[PDB]
Amino acid sequence: DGVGNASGDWHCDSTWMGDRVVTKSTRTWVLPSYNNHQYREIKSGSVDGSNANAYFGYSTPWGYFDFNRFHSHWSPRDWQRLINNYWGFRPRSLRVKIFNIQVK
Amino acid sequence: DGVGNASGDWHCDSTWMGDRVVTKSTRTWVLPSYNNHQYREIKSGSVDGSNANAYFGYSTPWGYFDFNRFHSHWSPRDWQRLINNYWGFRPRSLRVKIFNIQVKEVTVQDSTTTIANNLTSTVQVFTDDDYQLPYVVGNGTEGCLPAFPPQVFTLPQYGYATLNRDNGDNPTERSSFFCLEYFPSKMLRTGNNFEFTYSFEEVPFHCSFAPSQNLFKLANPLVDQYLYRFVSTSATGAIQFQKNLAGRYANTYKNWFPGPMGRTQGWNTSSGSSTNRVSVNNFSVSNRMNLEGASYQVNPQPNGMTNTLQGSNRYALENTMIFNAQNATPGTTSVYPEDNLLLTSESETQPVNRVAYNTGGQMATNAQNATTAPTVGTYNLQEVLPGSVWMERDVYLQGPIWAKIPETGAHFHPSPAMGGFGLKHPPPMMLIKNTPVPGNITSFSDVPVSSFITQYSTGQVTVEMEWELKKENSKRWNPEIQYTNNYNDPQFVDFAPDGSGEYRTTRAIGTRYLTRPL
Amino acid sequence: DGVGNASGDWHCDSTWMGDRVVTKSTRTWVLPSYNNHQYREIKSGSVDGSNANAYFGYSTPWGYFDFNRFHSHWSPRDWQRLINNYWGFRPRSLRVKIFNIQVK
Amino acid sequence: DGVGNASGDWHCDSTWMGDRVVTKSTRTWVLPSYNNHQYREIKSGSVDGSNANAYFGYSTPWGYFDFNRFHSHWSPRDWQRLINNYWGFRPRSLRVKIFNIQVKEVTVQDSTTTIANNLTSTVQVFTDDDYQLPYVVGNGTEGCLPAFPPQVFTLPQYGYATLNRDNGDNPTERSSFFCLEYFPSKMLRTGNNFEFTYSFEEVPFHCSFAPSQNLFKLANPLVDQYLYRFVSTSATGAIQFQKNLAGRYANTYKNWFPGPMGRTQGWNTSSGSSTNRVSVNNFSVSNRMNLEGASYQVNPQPNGMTNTLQGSNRYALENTMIFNAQNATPGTTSVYPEDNLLLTSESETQPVNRVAYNTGGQMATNAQNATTAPTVGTYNLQEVLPGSVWMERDVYLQGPIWAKIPETGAHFHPSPAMGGFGLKHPPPMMLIKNTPVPGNITSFSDVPVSSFITQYSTGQVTVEMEWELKKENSKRWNPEIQYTNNYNDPQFVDFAPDGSGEYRTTRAIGTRYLTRPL
């Protein structure tokens, strides 16, 4: 759209609504240029005296987003407020969004 | 929207429209990057030999907007035009707006700083609407829109003290940490603008009038009272009475009583310096309250008193609000004489409030027998009594507008000791910070990045308040007292910039000029 | 109504429903015949060396129901569940009922 | 309703209607006043030299109704008529009803007891519909509606063990106390009646058929397999193969495997007593599991085994269900010989489950070289393997109907080790107690009253279940085996009262009589 116009806002909260809670977290990230824009065949032989440490694979120039830890969605006070009052929970939805990019 | 298109205009005026006046002020601000985008746990132990100075809290990387001073909305000539014509006023609305933002990227590369402007950087902004954060706006703290429109100001850093333990710099299990990123902000790039509106709850008008009748001289001085009074005892122990004549107010029966009082000490200003006792450290001999095992000075004491008696140079300094003519720099521990200081005087209340350096009265200390004689005992403090009346402290152009009432649950007469309006839900706090932009990172590390590009932001802020006025309708015949520009041999004009361009203000203009028959 | 038919049931529970909680307590009471069905003028002089303990009044043959203690409506686990999650409360209604009487 | 009007009738019958049978049983019960209307904290330390016998819990003043035994719904002749004609069944509904209550007031005044009936006394009754209380119905505990309709029974007392600490009689911080008065009951006086209905979730039918084919003899005994098998190695180390001929089931390739197994010890019954080792205290040498530092005997072991091999007298006693012909009194610590005991035998499963006193198999212990020879190692326990099949324990007339599956979250194949149906939401527990009536109190005391009138209650209970049946459709030619009344020189009739009026039952009738080609 435009240079001098923000792509999104900072939403970061929690909203308990009965049998559902919606959490929201925003964060700032930085992405390096890995492998100078190349693919490299990474490989290792047996290290530590264990051939189970010997692998063969590929490192790419990409980076990824990982939201697989609880403390990325819950504050310590909203966690506590959950484990003291409920008998269980399970995730229902997800909705990621990337914005306000800046290449330097 | 766009880079080469202004987000808003500069509105700065006043508009009187009968019983309402709408003021508007725009100003330019600058926001530094505080704490390098981090939160720090600030703490202090007992300093100055007083463990009341020992705290524990957190300084954040945010700055806030403070519009809690009258001279941020009123010019000296519109203030004067208010205190000379109305009997009171109260705020009705508010409407802040931030626009024309500009983020600048500073670079000291090569021992030489180069300021370039970043067009993609943002600024974060949110208003605390539910009062979930520690309020710090109504405590007489610096950092408010300057008095003079041309002046540019830096936004002050947000921070707060929370519970500390045993008057030390350690926390308790109840000490709380508030994360401000845990609130939904709005992000702004150079082309965006932020708006926000608010409306005050009903609050009673401030009374900008002085009483023209003594509280203990309300009776007619021509007619006598149909009540008698015990005057003495005869040689036979028999009690004798006498009628209350007219004009003898020392003996009349009263209906209303003056208000609360708490004796402070009185010090004579210049003229009488000779009288004041020499070299006295007030701390040791000041009025202090204890809260959790620590002694705090309670200046300016609770409402219901007059720091001075009109016609004298003596002053109850601890019951006084003391401002400064020439603005000062942060961290100054210099000792100043009265000269460049504006000592406010609340004597236009003397007809109803009691002097703070005299004994409040005398009462009985015993019971008279055929043996013991009647004895009296002067008291120094008396609190609220049923059927008492007092007048609240006055507001000044350079003083605070409102205060937030602590939500403890129980309180009596919510009127801030520093003047202004006490509010349950005061104007929300508006925080703002520069979203951080990382330096050149080159490898993963589960450790957070600490290298940031140094930046700062500038912009404009317009705040438009609406006030309600109370028209004066007096049938006074002779002329009243007004606030007038009465100077003699002026070497400079007051309320105006001097040779260098620095704004001067040698007077503290209050509000009580008009009068009213009690 | 009838001898061999119960006047009411035993309801004793709590029911949290958002911003309202309704508690219910049933109990068995016993009522003695006080003062043999008479009114007596009870009175005392200064006792313990304090004339503030000296009174004059009347004891009646009646008994009364007192529900003025919190633990008459709340269990320790419902109290805890309240003081850990709310910022305040206030009573809204009341509804007493006496039944299944038996004179011996 | 009324005193002189019956609350319900006596329905007790069965009604076969195709693929459904509805049974109905009424019985008279008596309810004592347990614990004098109080709750007591019952606790035990390690007894018998085993800290697994150490618990901590609470005994309440309530009694409960237990309909968890087959012979509470089926007569011996309707059971027989089921196991001889159907391939399976499963419960569909339930409908309990309590009526014709009578509270009696006992009085021992003057060393002479006088039983008078109180017409105003109540009885409290509630069903635990949400499973909020500790379930105690499905654990093989006494107290169920008697087998014979004429018999009157006392309701057993409710109680439960909760968490104890370090295998001692003390509680933990997690030990919970459940107040049963904290549930909304219903009160009943002599003229009232209580009703309650329930419907089972889908549960798979019980399989009342025995297999008529060995699991490892499913192949055609006339045709050979097109698969070969490594038979030996030549002098040159070269591997040699041979085809799988017809009828040689020891060598055929199999597709399915027998089920889990865990070796227990085997003891010979009477005939072979001579063989059994003399004087052995089993506890020390029994199969035991450890849970929190304590050793518990796991009788009757998990499903997937046969306690005996048809044609032998040897028995895997720890994998067996042992009932008693003649009902016994509480607290009996007498040692009994096999005579009056009904040892159930699960041999009609031998074609598919493995014997519990033999080694489950042999596998390889090493790797053969030009040096080492191939070695095998017999194993005693093997758990579930992919592609295994087994048959569950059978149900008996005198055995349990259902069990409640613990709501931990994770479980594998929910089938109770004691037979029956495993249920997530089993028939609610129905508790009942006599509302207390105070003695002669005469003065206030903030202390609770402890003087109560001694009372007891009697009444009727009708429970009507509906079952679904699975019709047998076999094309077997020759005749099958049926359960028959085969006695020789009967000195009494079985399943009928003897001279004194005491009900006799010398057999344990199971369910597996019909057959099915695997």
- CA dihedral of B220, B222, B226, B227, whole degrees rounded to 10: 70
Cα separation, D43 vs D162, in Å, equals 10
Query: In b/e form, how buried is each residue of B130-156, taking b as 16+ CB within 10 angstroms?
Result: eeebbbbbbeeeebbbbbbeeeebebb
Cα separation, D75 vs D385, in Å, equals 40
List residues in chain B that are followed by a break over 2.5 Å (C to N). Answer: none
**Contact criterion met (CB below 8 Å) for D28 and D460:** yes
DSSP, collapsed to helix, strand or coil, labels residue B257 as strand
Contacts (Cβ under 8 Å, ≥6 apart) of D278: none
Cα separation, B28 vs B10, in Å, equals 10
Q: Which of D96, D205, D80, D111 lies closest to D467 in space, CA to CA?
A: D205
**Contact criterion met (CB below 8 Å) for D36 and D437:** no
| Closest chain A C-alpha to B429 CA, distance in angstroms | 18
- CA dihedral of D133, D137, D141, D143, whole degrees rounded to 10: 100
The residues that bridge with B103 in the sheet, in sequence order, are: B118, B457
B contacts of A32 (beta carbons < 8 Å): 441-444
D and B in touch (3+ CB pairs within 8 angstroms): no
Contacts (Cβ under 8 Å, ≥6 apart) of D152: D27, D28, D29, D30, D146
Q: What are the φ and ψ backbone dihedral angles of B225, each rounded to 5 degrees?
A: -95, 150
Omega into B300 within 30° of 0, i.e. cis? yes
Q: What is the 3-state secondary structure (H, E, C) of B300-354?
A: CCCCCEECCCCCCCEECHHHCCEEECCCCCCCCCCCCCCCCEEECCCCCCCCCCE
Paired tokens of B258: 């003056």
C contacts of D124 (beta carbons < 8 Å): 10
| Cα separations in angstroms, A96 against A5, A25, B366, D506 | 21, 10, 80, 71
Query: What radius of gyration do chain A's Cα atoms show?
Result: 20
Nearest to D437 among C2, C24, C102 (CB): C102
Cα separation, B351 vs B389, in Å, equals 11
| Closest chain A C-alpha to B110 CA, distance in angstroms | 20
Cα separation, B515 vs B214, in Å, equals 12
| Closest chain C C-alpha to A88 CA, distance in angstroms | 17
Contacts (Cβ under 8 Å, ≥6 apart) of B377: B362, B363, B364, B365
Chains adjacent to C (≥3 CB pairs closer than 8 angstroms):
A, D
Contacts (Cβ under 8 Å, ≥6 apart) of D377: D362, D363, D364, D365
Paired tokens of B328: 């000062």
Nearest to D184 among C4, C5, C10 (CB): C10
Cα separation, D158 vs D60, in Å, equals 6
Chains adjacent to D (≥3 CB pairs closer than 8 angstroms):
C
D437·C10 Cβ contact <8 A: no
C3: amino acid identity, one letter = V
Nearest to C9 among D182, D185, D449 (CB): D185
B contacts of A28 (beta carbons < 8 Å): 435-436, 438
Measured at the CA of B1, the angle between CA A102 and CA B6, to 5 degrees, comes to 115
Query: What radius of gyration do chain C's Cα atoms show?
Result: 20
**Contact criterion met (CB below 8 Å) for B362 and B378:** yes
Cα separation, B452 vs B436, in Å, equals 7
Q: Which of D237, D514, D174, D500 lies closest to D368 in space, CA to CA?
A: D237
Contacts (Cβ under 8 Å, ≥6 apart) of B243: B224, B225, B227, B228, B229
Q: Which of B365, B363, B359, B364 lies closest to B381 in space, CA to CA?
A: B359
- The number of residues in chain B equals 518
Query: What radius of gyration do chain D's Cα atoms show?
Result: 28
Cα separation, D80 vs D71, in Å, equals 12
**Contact criterion met (CB below 8 Å) for B228 and B244:** yes
B189·A4 Cβ contact <8 A: yes
C86 DSSP assignment: -
B110 DSSP assignment: T
Which DSSP helix (H) or strand (E) runs through A41? strand A40-43
- Residue D176: CB atoms within 10 A of its CB come to 12
A contacts of C84 (beta carbons < 8 Å): 84
Cα separation, D341 vs D344, in Å, equals 9
| Closest chain B C-alpha to A36 CA, distance in angstroms | 11
Query: In b/e form, how buried is each residue of A51-79, taking b as 16+ CB within 10 angstroms?
Result: eeeeeeeeeeeeeeeeeeeeeebbbeeee
| Chain A residue with Cα closest to B123 | A6
Query: What radius of gyration do chain B's Cα atoms show?
Result: 28
DSSP, collapsed to helix, strand or coil, labels residue B12 as coil
CB pairs under 8 A between A and B: 68
Chain centroid to CA B393: how far?
10
| Cα separations in angstroms, B475 against B393, B479, B480, D42 | 26, 11, 11, 89
DSSP, collapsed to helix, strand or coil, labels residue B283 as helix
| Closest chain A C-alpha to C95 CA, distance in angstroms | 28
Report resolution (Å) to 1 decimal: 2.9
- Helix%, strand%, coil% for chain D, nearest 5: 5, 35, 60
C contacts of A16 (beta carbons < 8 Å): none
Half-sphere exposure at residue D374, Cβ-oriented, CA atoms within 13 angstroms? 5
| Cα separations in angstroms, D514 against B17, B221, C37, D210 | 103, 123, 79, 6
Q: Which of D401, D424, D458, D422 lies closest to D94 in space, CA to CA?
A: D401
| Closest chain C C-alpha to A82 CA, distance in angstroms | 11
Nearest to D441 among C8, C11, C32 (CB): C32
Paired tokens of B37: 């985008």
Paired tokens of D297: 């005997």
Q: In terms of DSSP H, where are the helices of D42-97?
A: 76-83
Cα separation, C41 vs C57, in Å, equals 6
Query: In b/e form, how buried is each residue of B468-478, taking b as 16+ CB within 10 angstroms?
Result: bbbebeeeeee
Cα separation, D440 vs D447, in Å, equals 15
Measured at the CA of B471, the angle between CA B466 and CA B472, to 5 degrees, comes to 145
Cα separation, D105 vs D108, in Å, equals 10
A contacts of C81 (beta carbons < 8 Å): 85
C contacts of D443 (beta carbons < 8 Å): 32
- Residue D82: CB atoms within 10 A of its CB come to 21
Half-sphere exposure at residue D423, Cβ-oriented, CA atoms within 13 angstroms? 24
The residues that bridge with B271 in the sheet, in sequence order, are: none
D192·C5 Cβ contact <8 A: yes
Omega into B61 within 30° of 0, i.e. cis? no
B1·A4 Cβ contact <8 A: yes
Paired tokens of B436: 């951080």
DSSP string, D280-334: --GGGGS-EEESSS-EEE-TT--SSEES--TT--EE-GGG--EEESS---TT---
Chains adjacent to A (≥3 CB pairs closer than 8 angstroms):
B, C
Half-sphere exposure at residue D163, Cβ-oriented, CA atoms within 13 angstroms? 9
For β-strands D209-211 and D514-516, DSSP reports them as parallel
Give me the long-range contacts of D213-216 (CB less than 8 A, separation at least 24): D213/D351, D213/D517, D213/D518, D214/D249, D214/D351, D214/D518, D215/D256, D215/D257, D215/D258, D215/D351, D215/D352, D215/D389, D215/D518, D216/D249, D216/D252, D216/D254
The residues that bridge with B467 in the sheet, in sequence order, are: B21, B91
DSSP, collapsed to helix, strand or coil, labels residue B285 as helix
Paired tokens of B492: 């400079």
**Contact criterion met (CB below 8 Å) for D247 and D253:** no
C contacts of A84 (beta carbons < 8 Å): 84
Cα separation, D136 vs D143, in Å, equals 11
Paired tokens of D114: 């006088």
**Contact criterion met (CB below 8 Å) for D104 and D118:** yes
Which DSSP helix (H) or strand (E) runs through D58? strand D56-65
What are the start-end ranges of the E strands in C44-91? 56-59
Cα separation, D33 vs D453, in Å, equals 10
A37: left (phi > 0), else alpha (psi -120 to 50), else beta? left
**Contact criterion met (CB below 8 Å) for B203 and B18:** no
Query: In b/e form, how buried is each residue of D196-215, taking b as 16+ CB within 10 angstroms?
Result: bebebeebeebbbbbbeeeb
Contacts (Cβ under 8 Å, ≥6 apart) of B434: B31, B33, B37, B103, B121, B122, B123, B124, B455, B456, B457
